[PDB]
Amino acid sequence: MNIFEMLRIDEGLRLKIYKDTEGYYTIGIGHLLTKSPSLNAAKSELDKAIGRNCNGVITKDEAEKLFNQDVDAAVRGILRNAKLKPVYDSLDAVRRCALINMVFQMGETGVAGFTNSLRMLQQKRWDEAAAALAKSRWYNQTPNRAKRVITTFRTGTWDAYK
Ligand SMILES: [Cl-]
Ligand SMILES: [Cl-]
Ligand SMILES: [Cl-]
């Protein structure tokens, strides 16, 4: 099980524009196009992103090229961020995927706001961290994917995805 398989499980795969759980226009493997209400602002974002007139529809390969990009972006953003980098440095390989997950989903900034949780991860206090993470809107909005990730951090195993 790797980061790509973990996120394919978490976000699904869709070849036509769609709305995410928060109502925003998405495509492929949780690739956020726009926050804007405009289905038209979304088709343009899409074409900008693919480099073709897509008309809200893409291929699998395309969907995969975008995923490649986003995961890479997610990793480079952690490794560059002052609050995130030390945490990641301190983690084992499995818990590392867990922080990649959260960052792909909520961006660097939002994950960087979970101060206390970050602190307990870095200190290796698994149960405490799991407890704080849960006290979040994130947990309340997408509880199943959240518990999965939260379990990844508590355990250090792929149990929850297996
Ligand atoms: Cl926190
Ligand atoms: Cl809460
Ligand atoms: Cl969920």
Task: Tell me the domains of the chain and their CATH numbers.
Answer: 1-162 (1.10.530.40)
Structure tokens at 142: 């997408």
Q: Give the separation between CA 26 and CA 145, rounded to whole angstroms.
A: 17
Across the beta sheet with 14-19, the strand order is: 14-19, 25-28, 31-34
Q: How far is the CA of 136 from the centre of ligand 2 (A)?
A: 5
Phi-psi sector, 154: left (phi>0), alpha (psi -120 to 50), beta:
alpha
152 burial level (CB within 10 Å; 0-12, 13-18, 19+): buried
Nearest Cα to 130, choosing from 97, 103, 162, 156?
Answer: 156
**Resolution of the entry in angstroms:** 1.9
Q: How far is the CA of 144 from the centre of ligand 3 (A)?
A: 4
- Specify the length of the chain in residues: 162
> Residue 145: nearest ligand to its CA?
3
